[PDB]
Ligand binder design. Sequence first.
Ligand code: ADP
Ligand code: ADP
Ligand code: ADP
Ligand code: MG
Ligand code: MG
Ligand code: MG
Lengths: 526, 526, 526
Amino acid sequence: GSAKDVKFGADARALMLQGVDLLADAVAVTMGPKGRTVIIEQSWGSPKVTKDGVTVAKSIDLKDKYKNIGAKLVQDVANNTNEEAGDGTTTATVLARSIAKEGFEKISKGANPVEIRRGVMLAVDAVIAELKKQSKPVTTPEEIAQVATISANGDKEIGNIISDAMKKVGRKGVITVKDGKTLNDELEIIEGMKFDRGYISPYFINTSKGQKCEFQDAYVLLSEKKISSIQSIVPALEIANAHRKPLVIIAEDVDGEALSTLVLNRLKVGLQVVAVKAPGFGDNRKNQLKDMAIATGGAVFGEEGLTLNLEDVQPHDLGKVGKVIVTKDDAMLLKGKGDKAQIEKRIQEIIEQLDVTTSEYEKEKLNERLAKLSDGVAVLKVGGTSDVEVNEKKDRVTDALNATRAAVEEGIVLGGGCALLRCIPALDSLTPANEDQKIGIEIIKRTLKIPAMTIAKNAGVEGSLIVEKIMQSSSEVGYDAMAGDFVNMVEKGIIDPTKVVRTALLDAAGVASLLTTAEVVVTEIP
Amino acid sequence: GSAKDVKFGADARALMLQGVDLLADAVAVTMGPKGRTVIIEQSWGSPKVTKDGVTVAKSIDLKDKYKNIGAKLVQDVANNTNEEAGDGTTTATVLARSIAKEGFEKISKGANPVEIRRGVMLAVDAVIAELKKQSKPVTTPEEIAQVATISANGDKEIGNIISDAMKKVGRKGVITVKDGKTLNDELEIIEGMKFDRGYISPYFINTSKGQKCEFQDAYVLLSEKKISSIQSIVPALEIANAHRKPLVIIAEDVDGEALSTLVLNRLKVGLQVVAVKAPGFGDNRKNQLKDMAIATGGAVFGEEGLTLNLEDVQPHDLGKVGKVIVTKDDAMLLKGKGDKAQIEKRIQEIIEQLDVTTSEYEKEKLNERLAKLSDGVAVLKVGGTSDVEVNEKKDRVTDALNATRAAVEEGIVLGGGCALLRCIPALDSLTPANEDQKIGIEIIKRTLKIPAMTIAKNAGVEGSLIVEKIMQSSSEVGYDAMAGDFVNMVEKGIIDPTKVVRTALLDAAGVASLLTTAEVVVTEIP
Amino acid sequence: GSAKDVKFGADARALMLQGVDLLADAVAVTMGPKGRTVIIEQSWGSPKVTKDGVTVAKSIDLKDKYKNIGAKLVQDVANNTNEEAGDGTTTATVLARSIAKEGFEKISKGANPVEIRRGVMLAVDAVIAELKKQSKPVTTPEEIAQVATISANGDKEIGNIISDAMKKVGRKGVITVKDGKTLNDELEIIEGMKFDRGYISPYFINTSKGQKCEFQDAYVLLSEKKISSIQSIVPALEIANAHRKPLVIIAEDVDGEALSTLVLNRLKVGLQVVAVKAPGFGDNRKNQLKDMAIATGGAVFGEEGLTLNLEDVQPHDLGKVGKVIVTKDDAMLLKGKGDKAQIEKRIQEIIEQLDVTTSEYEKEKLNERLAKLSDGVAVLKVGGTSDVEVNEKKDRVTDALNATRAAVEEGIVLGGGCALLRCIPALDSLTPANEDQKIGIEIIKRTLKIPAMTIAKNAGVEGSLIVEKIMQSSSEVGYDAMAGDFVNMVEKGIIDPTKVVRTALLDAAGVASLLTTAEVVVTEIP
Ligand SMILES: Nc1ncnc2c1ncn2[C@@H]1O[C@H](COP(=O)(O)OP(=O)(O)O)[C@@H](O)[C@H]1O
Ligand SMILES: Nc1ncnc2c1ncn2[C@@H]1O[C@H](COP(=O)(O)OP(=O)(O)O)[C@@H](O)[C@H]1O
Ligand SMILES: Nc1ncnc2c1ncn2[C@@H]1O[C@H](COP(=O)(O)OP(=O)(O)O)[C@@H](O)[C@H]1O
Ligand SMILES: [Mg+2]
Ligand SMILES: [Mg+2]
Ligand SMILES: [Mg+2]
């Protein structure tokens, strides 16, 4: 293969550690309320600004291939943490560096770094256990706003808006985040099944106020194929006019003579019909029409396999909806009736798809908001006066959102970094099998102090003193680095989801303890 | 990814600040009446000359990647301001530099630049509030010519011609700007229903002078389909020859046997017919033809909503009409009857839409020019002796136009830079939460002085003397830098639209305050 | 975008001025009777020699990007002048340099170069006014030959031959210029209808001397389609034998049985017919045959739309010509009768075509020459012993032609450069609004002296002595630099069209006064 070059022992360890230390030093300035931002040059556009640890970590590759090995491993931990939890990234990085340094330093001739790894892993299990003991599940929706506002770097309006959306959509409902054009944040809430397609003809309009077509207690007709012929359209209208209900028709397109029947029967003898194009993306629209079919109760016409033809309809083949609103741009359907078991089956299906298949073709999420919209969904239109600002704020909002979900689903524990600090006594009551494992437990025991010392150090104060003042102090009290003084932690609102504290530490130790086992590294020649 | 290189703290800040300062220094020479032009090399052609801050800013990228980061952020400011307001670009640039410098200088170890950002943004909100209090909405059309003339760098003829066009088409009517072939400026006004399509055959000609079709009290025919067919044309001509009136026919195309009837039968006892292609281009042409339909009052043929066929016409068909003039390139219709419910329906439609698809789809204005063309539209044919001159003058005219629109839609406030200067006392009555925010408010307090000091500095005078002379002076008085002495501002005509002053400041502070938060910069290696 | 580099103030100004001065110094050696030529290397061929200012200016681009900016602006001046007037190019360049230098030098800190520009433009308006006052419209056809001979650098034979062409074709008729193979210039004048197509068969020959078919008082038949069949051709011959006239037939082709009828009736009962191919391209042929239709009076057969078929002809559907001569290679038709109004309509149509016709396809002129014949066009076959000679000379004759047309259409004024010198007192009676404008008027006042001093300097004499001596002298007298002494200008024939003198100065001052406004220059890095 390709010509290569290899390096041996503490020399190579010192190089890899140089890389780790560089990347860690770059990410770690972002940590905490007094933390600071990192600008990253973009190849094509104006540069990114961020406070996100993982996005800083991913941005840094290095010319020196060994230092690049270290860097790649630490960004691996930060990425794993971001994927598994969505916050706590800088924390995972500084933890990983601490384990890597303290690991590397203790290696000698007689030492057995694999066994030391076993010891640190023992220490991590023992720590997360005590963390779970410390966890107190969220209750009041004030705590939601607290976790959100702290995860959003002290922006109270963010955690307020998140609390509102989570109240009005539910704690495990769908919230999504997107760019505003407005200079301020907006919470929009959609209920129903909205999609971005409008009436084919203006003539369908009934209200003249807003220029909408508004219907209630309506029927739905779903066609996967185009409907140009009269032959397949007419029975669907006779059946609709029969039971005196309005009919909405969703199709790949509605045109030829069919549209002529629709807008003649519409303008004359005042029939209540609308026709709108299918949401429309090739094979995607098929899945969407299947979604709306299942939600509104009823079936899709045209070619799947079993073909149901448009000429032979029955009232049980249509759809039934509480309300419908359509405009030139978009269509919303509301309170559609169908089997709730079967629709939750559908949502369970799409989620179980998406989770094993995370492409950057995220229309699978666009499905999930739609079929879940009969509880509701919240859109978070983030503001700001410039794109880079909105990207920063949106990074923070997504962080706070993921943090709140982790909080509701697992629990909350003390903020600052105190939650890890309180786990040290649990390590003190361990029973190491040998010197190596004891070294591992010592490594983790030192490493737990780090996040608080870093958050304090960013504040401009004597962080490692502050850590010790915290340790002499009671369990409920910690250091408010923004206010610059000690406080009850949970009372003052400084709290972290347990899931994030668990995952950051677990990933960081998981990769770094493996890194410390290295004795020889092999790299490509420039 | 690509190999990268990172830099830490006030060093990287000093580099980025070098970039900011370079670009700002380049932009700032253009500012005010005594400002000066910037030549920019073009790759293919002869070089640009400009006084436009944003066009100077976009032209400058830098080899040093950090300085280039600063530069790119400043271009973000100037571009955002130009997009959102269309003037005030140089102002936004010098403001952004001032906030960036004064920001960077005040950071230390104990400082919290994000919180300083919060203080700055507080200060900007507090300032724009007082700006809105200061705003006095435009009334006399002398004020229009004043804001135009100041935004056009003292060219009175520009603001005169803009005032004339805005009078003759209305303050929210359509004005557009284009190159003359003439050495002087011209105002042309189009009235009617103008669109860019010319005959189909030459044999139609009636006046021989200009080679136009000039018709009066004519008929109009509207066909969404091609008219190539046998006997679908004839009743429309028999009915036209009946009431001895000329007919213009607009269609997707007119050709085959139809055209053969039209000519040669045009060349017979001078009855007047003309045929022209529909304004066209796919799905747009339907909306355009419905526009001309509703304007002349009713009109439908071709395939359908409600179906009207071309064989069955009546003398009241389909809309009417007044006068018509068409040439080889373009067609104009004039005196359409009845109508105004549907046009107000149209403005009600455009005002309610575009808000969705808000991110590039300005064709809604292309609609608005058409359906409002029975009031008018203005073309601004700018003159000059050379293309580069023409591009300069046109840049200035477009600036003055956007400025006049911002003035009519939001308000006017004091020129010079005094409007920002008067907002300082509003900052003096603020209640900062902490030292960081106080630093921010101080930053804005200093930065507000900048535009006035810069306009004076370009004059060759002691700008910061003049700033303080203005501050000691009364609210109504400021510095006329062209005349070189103090005057009543509003009386002398030196006034700025409030929209431009708010948007420049908001964007500049918005990006620069984010820039000051940086602690680490990451860039690609050369 | 692309990495760039910027420069500030008089430093950058001195570089741009270096470029301007280089290009100007190169062009200016060509000026006047004692001026000299410039050789320009061609990439592919043997080098150009020229006395044309604009062609020198366009040839010079510069490595130093700033100097190249200056260079691009001055060649912009020379190109604008050549496009707008066709002579006076060197003059426009030296004027532009003078305005640029005198502009740049007068700039300081307190100065306002845009306002200085305003003063300059004021001065130029004031100058061209007095120029128009000085203008005396051309009368005698001696004056045309004078303007031509002076614009052709003293070649009397050029202005003689141009005078002859202008007499024999008219003052606004068509003269064109092209290479001879003869070593001397020749004037050919074409009138009639010439095109390069010959008899299909030798049997058509009538003269036996030259082998031509010569006809008079003939008919012409025009067929856009092929003529193979008998039944379409025969009535056209019966109608010809009826009225005992010769028949010329022009067609896409004439062959099959038709041709057999033609040369049978030709060879056995000496009928007077010839048949010739259409001038031939594809779509061009339609316009050519319809041209010949319109010229000869009559109509084209075959399919346009309304189709007239060859079976149904009438004598008023043919064509009628004073004379016809045909050979193996070419066909000439003479004194064709038709509506002169309709033919002038046709020429008015083709000129209005070609003028807006962004075309490398010059056949529109090849059309225009044809339909203009028997009104006439003159071709100027320029001689010389070598291609480079022919091209230089052709440049000069084209200059003289454009100059004569400018003279007839606007006027003539004093040569030498005296006409501007006489305009200086008009500057003396101006009322400047401020110091800047006064600087501008002073700049123009100095620049006006330049062209005469340059023409004198090229002579090898003390140009600025000569300028002041002419200024001390009376209005009618100036300096004959070729004869080397003072003379009455108009009497000795040294005169310049007013259009060229106005346009050169107006363009030069127009861009240079803009150049002087620059404070910052931005250029791409090598
Ligand atoms: N006022 C505060 N006092 C003490 N610690 C805080 C305060 N606000 C936030 N923190 C701590 O900051 C940490 C969050 O780090 P952050 O900068 O959001 O990056 P990440 O979440 O990716 O680690 C949490 O562990 C939290 O305990
Ligand atoms: N005669 C004048 N006296 C004082 N200030 C002026 C005068 N003319 C224009 N200004 C000021 O110049 C500013 C406009 O700057 P300009 O050169 O148009 O660049 P931009 O508008 O792109 O920032 C306005 O704020 C206005 O107050
Ligand atoms: N015999 C002459 N005496 C004085 N001036 C002359 C004479 N011949 C030509 N000129 C001047 O030369 C100028 C023309 O310059 P020329 O060399 O033709 O290049 P261009 O026409 O491109 O400027 C005219 O202004 C004319 O007055
Ligand atoms: Mg976070
Ligand atoms: Mg401006
Ligand atoms: Mg000449």
